[model samples]
Target: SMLGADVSLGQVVITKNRNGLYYRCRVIGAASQTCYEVNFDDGSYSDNLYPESITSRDCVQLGPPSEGELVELRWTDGNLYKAKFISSVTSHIYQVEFEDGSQLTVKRGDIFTLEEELPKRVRSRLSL
Candidate 1:
């Protein structure tokens, strides 16, 4: 789980580690600039795990969001992407309007998964 306060700040702690399976985490501190810590139950907490260890990981929940709210997306590289809220079906799933005028239905399962690679046309728009 990508638990953090914001894109630029936060640390991820692994709470449970069974056969290399991470099971729990928490996002503590500031809302957008907080740190994250993980907790594991597999007796392997002594090994230091950094945030970069689990970058590009996404999780889709099971609910939706209300109007005016936004789906906040955070990258391991400290990039924050947001999708406008349309509605939420449950506490774990929601609909968002992307910046490119595309709508995507996402849930906790949707997390960690990239919707699509950066399109060449879109990449060309960037000054980089």
Candidate 2:
């Protein structure tokens, strides 16, 4: 079986565009035998995008955030909190605590791993 064949129409994905920037986009249709047409949430679209240009969310694993890891958490108040990883509530969610003694469960995508590149939402803003 093909590894990237898991990518199908309508799957939302993060893709690195030809402009050397990454975008959250949806697979709109097949462009070729090994390429796809994608519509970006940022009001752009591209055809002939190879699977290599798209990141399969199902395959992303930064080894799971360890307990006590320093991270930036996206809170319900629409703000980012510098927090500590408390523990896992599920495979894709975690309990985190802020310095002010507040705690809440956050999604895997909301926990900005400090050691990694900026989060997608942030990077999408500062593209230059």
Candidate 3:
């Protein structure tokens, strides 16, 4: 239990080792000024960033899509196309056919669901 875990400024909600994984960073000087200085602890925050450019929510990744599961399976080519998991292949890994009449073989963590769509916005800011 991270009941003893250190909590400090700029630290993202770190798990209790108990609650969840955390982010380490400081929100800097002006909201409208710039947020390039700190990042959500997980990183890739390598590029420049501004706070509003950051929209975030925590989510646990999903496992392989199951039968009747609606998802967007990633194509080997890396495009995420929508599909439905129809059946099994090797016990866990399953098969999927696109809602568009195409198909792709996918694994756990290779899918994404639209919890919500991003609003049309300027590309100038970074998205966390």
Candidate 4:
């Protein structure tokens, strides 16, 4: 199993233009804002602004893991800041929390991850 892997802040998304797998990630400091830009698999990029009525728990998995599912942002920087679900309605969305504790709504499609997947790392200071 892929244990001890360092999972960062990002989402797996399928775009209308590209037919391959890709991860839309938020720039580290931009998570607290209403809009974020992400790069696509086709060497393209786009900006995602907050839409009305979208929240952190609103995004639904498009399909099963084998069927190109979208994994919502759960923890960023190793904090259990939000929740994840198996299914939800179309209006469901994800939320971003600011450093001061305020929240901003976000979409799974707005953020992207790195092309090269990083291995999960164990926290030496916290390891037993």
Query: Which candidate's TM-score is highest?
Result: 2
Per residue, candidate 1 scores C-alpha lDDT tens digits across 1-128 of 22431221122222212233222232232221112233333322212223233333322332233444434534456765444433322123333333333434333332222233544543343221
Runs with alpha carbons beyond 4 Å of true place in candidate 3: 1-63, 91-128
lDDT digits (tens) for residues 1-128 of candidate 3: 12222232232221111112121122111111121222223442222322222222111233233445544433345554443334332212223443233333333233222332323331222123
Residue 122 error, candidate 1, Å:
18
lDDT at 89, model 3: 26
Model 4 alpha-carbon drift over 4 Å, by segment: 1-92, 113-128
Off by over 4 Å in 1: 1-91, 113-128
TM-score of each: 0.18, 0.24, 0.21, 0.19
What's the true lDDT of residue 14 in model 1?
A: 22
Clashing pairs in 3: 10-25, 12-23, 14-22, 15-20, 16-19
lDDT of each: 0.32, 0.41, 0.28, 0.30
Model 4 lDDT at residue 110: 36
Who wins the lDDT comparison?
2
Q: In candidate 3, how many Å is residue 29 off?
A: 61
Ranking by TM-score: 2, 3, 4, 1
Which model is ahead, 1 or 4, in terms of lDDT? 1
Candidate 2 — which pairs collide?
A: none
lDDT of 4 by residue, 24-107 (tens): 323222222233233334454334422221233342232222212322342224432222122222222444443334444444
Error of 3 at 72 (Å): 0.8
Q: Residue 124 error for model 3, in Å?
A: 71
Model 3 alpha-carbon miss at residue 19, Å = 61
